[PDB]
Amino acid sequence: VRMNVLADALKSINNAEKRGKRQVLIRPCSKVIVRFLTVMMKHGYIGEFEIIDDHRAGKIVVNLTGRLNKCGVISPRFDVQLKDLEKWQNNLLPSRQFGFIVLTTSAGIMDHEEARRKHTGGKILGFFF
Amino acid sequence: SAKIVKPNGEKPDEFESGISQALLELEMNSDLKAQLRELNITAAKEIEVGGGRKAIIIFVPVPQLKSFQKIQVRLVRELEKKFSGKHVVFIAQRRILPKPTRKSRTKNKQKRPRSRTLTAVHDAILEDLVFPSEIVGKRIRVKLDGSRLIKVHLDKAQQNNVEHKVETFSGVYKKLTGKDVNFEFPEFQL
Amino acid sequence: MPLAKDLLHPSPEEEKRKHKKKRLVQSPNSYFMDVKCPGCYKITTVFSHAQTVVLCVGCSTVLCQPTGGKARLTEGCSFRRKQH
Amino acid sequence: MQNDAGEFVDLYVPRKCSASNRIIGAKDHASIQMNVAEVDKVTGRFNGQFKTYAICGAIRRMGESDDSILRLAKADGIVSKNF
Amino acid sequence: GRMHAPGKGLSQSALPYRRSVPTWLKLTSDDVKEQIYKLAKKGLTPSQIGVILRDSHGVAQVRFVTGNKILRILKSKGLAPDLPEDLYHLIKKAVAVRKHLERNRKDKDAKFRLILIESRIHRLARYYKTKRVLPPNWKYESSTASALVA
RNA sequence: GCUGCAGUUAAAAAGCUCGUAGUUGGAUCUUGUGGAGGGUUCCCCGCCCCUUGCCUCUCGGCGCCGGCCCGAAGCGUUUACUUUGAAAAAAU
């Protein structure tokens, strides 16, 4: 059965990007998916997006610009502390110059570079580059 | 009695006593005497709209509103005839209760009903404004700056009852909730 | 499907072709209709996929028969859909 | 690529596909550059002015270049947003 | 997919987006409740009341005319049964197969299908016992089963 | 082989189905204007509806010409998580 909705959303975008398609449809929608998409959009990796109401959790249509190399999920939501975050970005990123880990923290869902300014740890959700 | 609007200390205002006088005097002619019965209006306000003109909002208590809507098609037509070129809307006197989890006092002895949530109140206020017509569907657009716009679809029958008021609906819903809305008609509907 | 068709605006002939649960927003194919018969003429309402053997207020032996799809009328004067 | 003095340090900057926004490599021999003539608006005649596009080899071999060149020619004025 | 078969078919209802009552419907909330109370005296289960109302009257969804689901309408008047109606139907099917096997002990398919019925009774009873619909001491028994449905 | 392996043919998926413990489990319930540090909107004050969510005492200092105000306390449904204090032999 469907054990996790965020893993479907990112796998669906990742297969559409590799085929060269200009749009994709995500279903079911969730509060976690809308907040994750917003972090990719603010850094310039995807275009703007629209939500459809249907009285059953809803759907999203997203616009693609061709810049995204990958996006992905870490399935157990492991806890991270500021001293251990260096080991995770050494494992998951392609260079020290670009790409982002996404964390959930009591100050909100955010970019791993913002978590250092806000002096906060959290749980891992995923990444993009 | 007259001056039916608002709780104690707030009541004497000229505009709001004026609109509630204009409502309660209308039961005195024989046609609306059949169907008005001094039923409560809780408040009224006069507010600016995007064309530089004015519109009025009338606030109705929840167990009375199911009776107001049954006569609103004549009662608002009489008020929009009598006032100086204004547009009118009736809306419910809904209350919002605060979030129990770490944003309010909370205990086992009473539970917050989901009918008193902010989401269930703001999406009910949207249905009151459009009343002569019915909502066919909603969509929400997220912009590159992180802002939102709502797109509302209205039924294709009864266009003649709302097309001249979409410009007041956007300004009224903005001032009741803080959010941008556009009102539109569908290409086709199943 | 080409590389660039937009997903937010399907034409009504693209939407009417596909399954009721797989449309952009869901909608049934069934409907309500008003039905009338000879000998007694009190009009009545019926559902197009009925399971019941309907008897009219005019007390005739059968108004319609149930079936594996739409129900079939006994040569009644109306099959007219209600608009909403 | 730039350094902390602000000067550039790449050998060259490679081109990208007009249909798809992906880099065309030095050995992509299936790729193309298309060139198309403009005409004057009074007499429908060539004035020597033109427009250009570049297409990835991977989009050509799946059969999508004809529709991509058409969308590009409707986005520019050439096909005039009716068909 | 289905819980005890290899099949994965898709058939189900699909409700419209519009929850409102239509303007042509002549019925009203308390007259719909009286028709429900009359139909309940004939011994009709809630599932049968909703098809009689959909086929022969205007009401497509009773929950949209009257603000309540129709088992709540019966419970608030004391008309509801002492055993839930889907658990009742599974128990009636188990005793029908047990009356077959007493004279047909060679029917090894019927022996296999009885395991798949009674394990589906146990899964449903365990749910209703945690939500206080049934006593904690309630138990299905192969000797007692006939007395649960007569 | 947690990060990080493999099971059509090289070594390897129980003949097939049910099922208690174990592991895993769908959507949903409060936001934008104003000021400081910084920018050209967001992180601290105070607000559409609640800003410690309530409350009114009494043993106990404050502000002023008795009465009314502002720091404790009852405490915010219970935990994991995270950030910060305290307290932990030396040698290595």
Swiss-Prot record, chain A:
SUPFAM superfamilies: Ribosomal protein S8 (SSF56047). The gene is RPS15A. GO terms for molecular function: structural constituent of ribosome. The keyword Ribosomal protein applies. GO terms for cellular component: cytosolic ribosome; nucleolus; ribonucleoprotein complex. It comes from the Eukaryota. Keywords: Cytoplasm, Nucleus, Ribonucleoprotein, Ribosomal protein. The keyword Cytoplasm applies. This is Small ribosomal subunit protein uS8. The modification N6-succinyllysine is found at residue 87. Belongs to the universal ribosomal protein uS8 family. It is found in: Cytoplasm; Nucleus, Nucleolus. Transmembrane segments: none annotated. HAMAP family: Ribosomal_uS8_A. Pfam families: Ribosomal_S8. InterPro entries: Ribosomal_uS8 (IPR000630), Ribosomal_uS8_CS (IPR047863), Ribosomal_uS8_sf (IPR035987).
Swiss-Prot record, chain B:
Keywords: Acetylation, Cytoplasm, Cytoskeleton, Isopeptide bond, Nucleus, Ribonucleoprotein, Ribosomal protein, Ubl conjugation. It holds the Pfam family Ribosomal_S7e. GO terms for biological process: ribosomal small subunit biogenesis; rRNA processing; translation. The keyword Cytoplasm applies. One of its GO terms (cellular component) is centrosome. The keyword Secreted does not apply. It is found in: Cytoplasm, Cytoskeleton, Microtubule organizing center, Centrosome; Cytoplasm; Nucleus, Nucleolus. Component of the small ribosomal subunit. The ribosome is a large ribonucleoprotein complex responsible for the synthesis of proteins in the cell. Required for rRNA maturation. Part of the small subunit (SSU) processome, first precursor of the small eukaryotic ribosomal subunit. Component of the small ribosomal subunit. Part of the small subunit (SSU) processome, composed of more than 70 proteins and the RNA chaperone small nucleolar RNA (snoRNA) U3. Binds IPO9 with high affinity. Interacts with NEK6. Interacts with DESI2. Interacts with IPO5, IPO7 and KPNB1; these interactions may be involved in RPS7 nuclear import for the assembly of ribosomal subunits. Belongs to the eukaryotic ribosomal protein eS7 family. This is Small ribosomal subunit protein eS7. It comes from Oryctolagus cuniculus (Rabbit).
Swiss-Prot record, chain C:
Residues 1-23 are annotated as: Disordered. GO terms for biological process: ribosomal small subunit biogenesis; rRNA processing; translation. A zinc finger (C4-type) spans 37-59. Its main location: cytoplasm. GO terms for cellular component: cytosolic ribosome; cytosolic small ribosomal subunit; nucleolus; postsynaptic density; small-subunit processome. The modification Phosphoserine is found at residue 11. Keywords: Cytoplasm, Metal-binding, Nucleus, Phosphoprotein, Ribonucleoprotein, Ribosomal protein, Zinc, Zinc-finger. Residues 1-16 have a biased composition (Basic and acidic residues). It is found in: Cytoplasm; Nucleus, Nucleolus. One of its GO terms (molecular function) is zinc ion binding. The keyword Nucleotide-binding does not apply. Binds 1 zinc ion per subunit. Zn(2+) binds at residues 37, 40, 56, 59. It holds the Pfam family Ribosomal_S27e. Component of the small ribosomal subunit. Part of the small subunit (SSU) processome, composed of more than 70 proteins and the RNA chaperone small nucleolar RNA (snoRNA) U3. Component of the small ribosomal subunit. The ribosome is a large ribonucleoprotein complex responsible for the synthesis of proteins in the cell. Required for proper rRNA processing and maturation of 18S rRNAs. Part of the small subunit (SSU) processome, first precursor of the small eukaryotic ribosomal subunit. Belongs to the eukaryotic ribosomal protein eS27 family. This is Small ribosomal subunit protein eS27. It comes from Oryctolagus cuniculus.
Curated annotation (Swiss-Prot), chain E:
Keywords: Acetylation, Cytoplasm, Isopeptide bond, Nucleus, Phosphoprotein, Ribonucleoprotein, Ribosomal protein, Ubl conjugation. There is a cross-link at residue 42 (Glycyl lysine isopeptide (Lys-Gly) (interchain with G-Cter in SUMO2)). The modification N6-succinyllysine is found at residues 26, 33. There is a cross-link at residue 26 (Glycyl lysine isopeptide (Lys-Gly) (interchain with G-Cter in ubiquitin)). The modification Phosphoserine is found at residue 29. The modification N6-acetyllysine is found at residue 26. One of its GO terms (molecular function) is structural constituent of ribosome. Ubiquitinated at Lys-26 by RNF14 and RNF25 in response to ribosome collisions (ribosome stalling). One of its GO terms (biological process) is translation. It comes from the Eukaryota. SUPFAM superfamilies: S15/NS1 RNA-binding domain. GO terms for cellular component: cytosolic ribosome; cytosolic small ribosomal subunit; nucleolus. Coiled coil: none annotated. It is found in: Cytoplasm; Nucleus, Nucleolus. The modification Phosphotyrosine is found at residue 37. Component of the small ribosomal subunit. The ribosome is a large ribonucleoprotein complex responsible for the synthesis of proteins in the cell. Part of the small subunit (SSU) processome, first precursor of the small eukaryotic ribosomal subunit. During the assembly of the SSU processome in the nucleolus, many ribosome biogenesis factors, an RNA chaperone and ribosomal proteins associate with the nascent pre-rRNA and work in concert to generate RNA folding, modifications, rearrangements and cleavage as well as targeted degradation of pre-ribosomal RNA by the RNA exosome. Belongs to the universal ribosomal protein uS15 family. PANTHER family: RIBOSOMAL PROTEIN S15P/S13E, SMALL RIBOSOMAL SUBUNIT PROTEIN US15. This is Small ribosomal subunit protein uS15. It comes from Oryctolagus cuniculus.
